[PDB]
Every structure is written in C-alpha cells, then in structure tokens.
Amino acid sequence: HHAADYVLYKDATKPVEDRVADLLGRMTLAEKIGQMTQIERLVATPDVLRDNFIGSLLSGGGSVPRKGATAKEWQDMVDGFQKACMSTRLGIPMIYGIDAVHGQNNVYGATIFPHNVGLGATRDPYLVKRIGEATALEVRATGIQYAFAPCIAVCRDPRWGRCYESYSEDRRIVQSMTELIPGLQGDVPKDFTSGMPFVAGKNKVAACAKHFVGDGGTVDGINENNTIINREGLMNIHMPAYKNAMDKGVSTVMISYSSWNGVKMHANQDLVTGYLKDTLKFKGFVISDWEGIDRITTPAGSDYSYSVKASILAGLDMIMVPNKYQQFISILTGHVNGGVIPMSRIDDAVTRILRVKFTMGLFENPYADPAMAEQLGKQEHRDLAREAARKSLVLLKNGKTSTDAPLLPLPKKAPKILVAGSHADNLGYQCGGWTIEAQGDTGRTTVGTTILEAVKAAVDPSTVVVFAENPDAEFVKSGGFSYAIVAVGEHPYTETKGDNLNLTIPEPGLSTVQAVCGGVRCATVLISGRPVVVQPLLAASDALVAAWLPGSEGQGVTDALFGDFGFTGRLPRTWFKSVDQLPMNVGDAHYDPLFRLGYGLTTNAT
C-alpha cells in the first residue's frame, strides 16, 4: 500500500494480525529470542539492547534512575533505551514494565493509593476502575507503558506476606475488582472477543493479571510455596477472576512462583497452555516472574538449561530474566538449534508479544510524551486516593459499652488533643510495601500527608494539637486532653519477609494504646496489611479503626474520624480470634471469627 520502500508491519492502517505475521516472517532466530527476553534497566545499555534485539525492560522494586528523580528523568531514561531498540534492523520498540500496584509507587511524588485489601473493603469496583485510570496517567507520566497489576490472588491465609495485595479471601470480591483492568487499559469495544489483549492507546498501559494461579492458596501462607487443593477448588477459588480478566482484555499474565499439588507453575504445561491459552483462549503474552524459571529447580538456578526448556515448553512467552540475559539467550538458542524446542513454540511466543505491542499502539508511539509529566502526583488523583482511603476504613468498635456516647465522630474544636503512636506521623508506614522500595520504608519517603498532618489540617484553629510518639500514662493524665488519636501497627513488608506466623504487631504499639487510652478517651487507628491479633487493642480502646495501608493521603483517615463522611467500609477478610485457627475462611465448617467477613460499624456524617 504505496511507496517503493513500503514495509507492511510499519503501516499503522493495517490490521494487527497482518502486521504481526508480516513482521514475524522477516525475523531471525536471534530477533525472535530477543523479543522473548526482558531485562532489568540495571543491566541495560544501548549496545546490549541492540546486539541482543531485546524485547522488554523493567524496573524491579526500587530500580530507579536516581533517588528523587522527576517524571522527566524517567521519560529521558526510558526514551534512551527505546532509541537503542528502535535502531535495530527491524526497529521493534521495547515495552517497559514496572510494579505500579497502588499508584506508580516506585516513583518519588507519585500518588500512592490504598493497597488492595483496603480497596476490597470499599466494595466499590467503579472507584477501583478510576484508580486504574489515574495510575495509567501517572505511569505514562514517567514514559512507562506496562504495569504488573492487578494482583488477583485470593489470599486464603493472612500469614502470607502478600495478603495485602489480595482484594479479599472471597473470590467474588476479587472478581468484582478486576475493573482495575479497563481502568489501566481502557474499556474494550462492544464486539470484543474474551482473551484478546487490549490497550486503548498512548494514554493507557498494558496490564498484567498476576500471579497465575493459586498464589494466595499456599500451605500456612508460605510465600512461593505449594498450594494443595483439588482441581475443583482451584477452579472455584483461585481461577475465577482470570476469566473476568480475559473478558476485559488483560494484555498479559504473569506466572506464579508457587506450585499446585507439587508442580511448579512455571513448568505447568497443562495449566499455562492447556487451560489459560487453549481453554480460556488467552491471546496476549505470558510472562515469568522474576527469576521464576530459576526457581523451578532446588536449589534455584542449579540447572538453568532445564529451567529454560521446562518454562518455554510449558507455554511461557516472555522471560523476566532479569540479569543473565546472555546465558538465557544462549541456552534458548541451543535448544532451538538442537530441536528440543520447536520453532512453532518460538513463533507462538513472539506472535503474542508482537500482538500486544501492535495492539497498544507501541509502534506508533514508542516514545514518551513530555506533556504527560505533570500527571505525576496531580491533586485530582490525590483527591481520588483520599476518597479511597476513607472508604477503605473499617470501624470495628465505637464505644466500650453499648451505653457510652459514641466517640466517633470526634469534634474538630476542642481545647487540646493528643496525636500519638509510631504510625501517627510516618508516611512510609502508612503506605506499606511497594512504596519507593519493594519492602517499603520508614519516614518521609515521598510526597504525602501523615495522620498527624491531616489532624492539623482538619481541626479548628483554636484546637491545640500535641504529638508524642510514645507518651507514658502520666503525660496523658496530666495533659488536659479532650481525646487522643493513636495510630500503631505493622511495619512495611512484601513477599517472604512479610510471611508471619504470629500476626502480633510490634511493640511499642499496644503499650502506647494502653497508656493513652488509660488516660483519655481514644480512637485507635490500626495500620496493617491484614488482620492481626486485636483483642488487647480492642479492650483498651473506646474506638478502633482498621485502616489497612491507606497510602499517601492521610486526610482520608481524618475525613471519617471528624465526621466529614460516615464510615462505610466492610471487612474483606475474616478477622480471626487466634492464629491457631488459621486458615479460616467464610463458608468454612468450623467458622469461629472474631469479626466475620462483611462486618463493619457505620457512622453518619456530622
């Protein structure tokens, strides 16, 4: 279709499948295996990207051009890598991925939304869609086109260090929150075939349903472990939301480190090819987790030749190496050259990769848009996070006895109030994991409003606010306080570091609540990724709020404390009496919760 140097794959007016086929038929083995390779920015250089025809880059947690980098610094970095990729023979653009799992959370100044467990507490799929939308804009602010989200794990045991990344122990709630997908990617058209990939264009991002499948079903919540459940329960609990994701055009699917009845997901042909591809008709690309193929073996990495064979024969399309690309490419090339992996498998992986890239407009808009940089941390997005934080809060107690005056909502005007606790003025703790680093961090790590800052922004000008992180009982009794707001809870974590068999909050936490509430009527705000042992905190407190990990916008907390809005959140998980009960889920036979799934007290706006 027209000039003498015409190349059909480069013609934006042509159908995606025709462009895919046209380009695939021109590629060498090296160019094909390159597409299948995703590398860390930390090992990327212009020569590495060209010489190995690399398909994809990522940032792992904390993998950033520098601390405090601006949106434009990110764009410049991503465009630098893209320029190298576009200078290859075929000029296939790379796709750049990142964990934007509660906003664009590796980036300084990005809006940080509540983590998924709190979003489950909202029962508000449209709010979740709007968070997807805003997160797409903040990702594209940084020049990035691909988010490793949503995590649609169904966490069945809160001892797991990633339980906060699950919207609920109830698969129906997780299913409902797959609205994140069309928020991130755009709505699919009226005619759409379930399982096809979709992204609307340059203001949206490719999504990723992860981690397939049963990541939240592991024994005793041990991260990356074995999920022991018959096929019926796998399909009834862990699988459903993947079909909702197919229906909404999720572009990619990431494979889990976990095993199912002793078989490593990253080696499971029956589930990855037989089920996801052949039965759900998924036509986007399947990506590994980070050194996920390595972890097929014990020790991990002890037979990388086998890792490559097993994973690629199982049906994985793109491998998150993410460092040893030379070894990955060499070993895979060897296997193809020896007939151990057929060309049909290579061509399928590359067809899927290219399909997503052409569908999302990456060949038309390979570079960043500098007018998008100002989307990062935009006040309108912060307003949305603030609404989400407030809606996520679950009020568990509001009065020690049925005849007490209800403590919440608290008055904005009082002569003197106390804000206390390790979590009252600590932005990093209120954001939790996957914020600036994977494990998260402590203190003022990004731009935001702590609980203390939000209190001061909310109260009448005549109200004196005193902060004391860990006051003793006498300080409180002597201070002339009208009431106290005390905030405590878990420290930031993710993955295996978060696995925890006792689920008791660190001290001083309870001891501060006791000292404060002992002296003055108190609202306790518990910051956690999951239910934790809570009877002792309840016994001391007039009121207590499960605030989960509400993110950067602390004013969401005070919005409900001071009665600007009423409490509406409902537990998205069972609150256990003891960890000896676990696992214990709604619908179980011996169900003896401290608070059942769906529990939540309400207030009315002042």
Ligand X SMILES: *[C@@H]1O[C@H](CO)[C@@H](O)[C@H](O)[C@H]1NC(C)=O
Ligand Y SMILES: OC[C@H]1O[C@@H](O)[C@H](O)[C@@H](O)[C@@H]1O
Q: Which residues are catalytic?
A: 289, 495
Give the residue with the Cβ less far from ligand Y, 289 or 294.
Answer: 289
3-state secondary structure of 475: helix
What 3-state class would DSSP assign to 467? strand
Q: Least distance in Å: CB of 60 to ligand Y? A: 4
Selection from ligand X, ligand Y, none that 226 binds (CB < 5 to 8 A by kind) is: ligand X
Show Cβ contacts of residue 430 under 8 Å, excluding neighbours closer than 6 positions: 423, 448, 450, 451, 527, 549, 550, 551, 552, 554
Spatial CB neighbours of 57, under 8 Å, sequence gap ≥ 6: 38, 39, 40, 41, 44, 49, 81, 94, 96, 97
Nearer to ligand X, 64 or 393 (CB): 393
What's at 544, amino acid-wise? L
Output the smallest distance, CB 265 to ligand X, in A. Answer: 10
Closer to ligand X by Cβ: residue 124 or 224: 224
For residue 59, the surrounding DSSP H or E stretch is strand 56-59
Between residue 414 and residue 443, which ones bind ligand Y under the rule CB under 6 A?
none
The number of helices, as runs of H, and strands, as runs of E, in the chain is: 21, 17
> Which of ligand X, ligand Y, none sits in contact with 473, Cβ below 5 to 8 A by type?
none
Minimum separation from the CB atom of position 165 to ligand Y (A):
8
For the segment 440-499, give every residue that binds ligand Y (CB under 6 A).
Answer: 495
Packed helices 304-314 and 325-337: angle between N→C axes, nearest 10 degrees: 70
What's the min distance (Å) between Cβ of 343 and ligand Y?
Answer: 29
Neighbouring residues of 581: CB distance < 8 A, sequence distance ≥ 6 = 590, 592
Which residues touch 271 (CB under 8 Å, ≥6 apart)?
212, 213, 260, 265
- Angstrom distance (rounded) from CA 20 to CA 6: 16
Residue number, 138 or 224, with CB nearest to ligand X: 224
What's the CA gap between 79 and 558, in Å, rounded? 41
User: Which of residues 55, 61, 249, 428 is near ligand Y by CB under 6 A?
Assistant: 61
| Residue 60 near ligand Y by CB under 6 A | yes
Residue placing its CB nearer to ligand X in the complex, 146 or 562: 562
What's the CA gap between 455 and 148, in Å, rounded? 34
Q: Does 289 bind ligand Y (CB under 6 A)?
A: yes
What residues line the site for ligand X (CB under 6 A)?
222, 224-226, 259, 500-502, 504, 602-604
Closest CB to ligand X among residues 230, 604: 604
Binds ligand Y (CB under 6 A): choice among 73, 99, 387, 490? 99
Count of residues that bind ligand Y according to CB under 6 A: 8
How far apart are CB 339 and ligand Y at their closest, in Å? 32
Whichever of 60 and 593 has its CB closer to ligand Y, that residue is: 60
Q: Which does 509 bind (CB under 5 to 8 A by kind): ligand X, ligand Y, none?
A: none
Minimum gap (Å) between residue 226 Cβ and ligand X: 4
Alpha helices for 432-484 (secondary structure H): 451-458, 473-478
Q: CA 65 to CA 76: how far, in whole Å?
A: 10
DSSP result, 532-594: ---HHHHHH-SEEEEEE---SBTHHHHHHHTTSS------SS-B-S-GGG-S--TT-TT---S
Q: Which does 222 bind (CB under 5 to 8 A by kind): ligand X, ligand Y, none?
A: ligand X
Give the H or E element holding residue 287: strand 285-287
Q: Is 294 in the site for ligand Y (CB under 6 A)?
A: no
State the nearest-atom distance from the C-beta of 503 to ligand X, in Å: 7
Which residues are bridge partners to 210 per DSSP? 151
Question: What is the gyration radius of the CA atoms in the chain, in angstroms?
Answer: 25
State the DSSP H helix or E strand holding residue 306, giving kind and residue range, or none if neither.
helix 304-314
Three-state SS at 228: coil
Among 160, 167, 290, 481, binds ligand Y (CB under 6 A): 290
**Nearest CB to ligand Y, comparing residues 251 and 449:** 251
C-beta of 322 vs 550, nearer to ligand Y: 322
**From the list ligand X, ligand Y, none, partner contacted by residue 290 (C-beta under 5 to 8 A by kind):** ligand Y
CB of 311 to ligand X, least distance (A): 16
> Which of ligand Y, ligand X, none does 500 bind, CB closer than 5 to 8 A by kind?
ligand X
Question: Which listed option, ligand X, ligand Y, none, makes contact with residue 261 (CB within 5 to 8 Å by class)?
Answer: none
Q: Are 583 and 184 a contacting pair, CB within 8 Å?
A: no
**Binding of ligand Y at residue 73 (CB under 6 A)?**
no
Cβ at position 501, least distance to ligand X in Å: 6
Residues in Cβ contact with 233 at an 8 Å cutoff, skipping those fewer than 6 apart: none
Interface residue list for ligand Y (CB under 6 A)? 60-61, 99, 148, 210, 289-290, 495
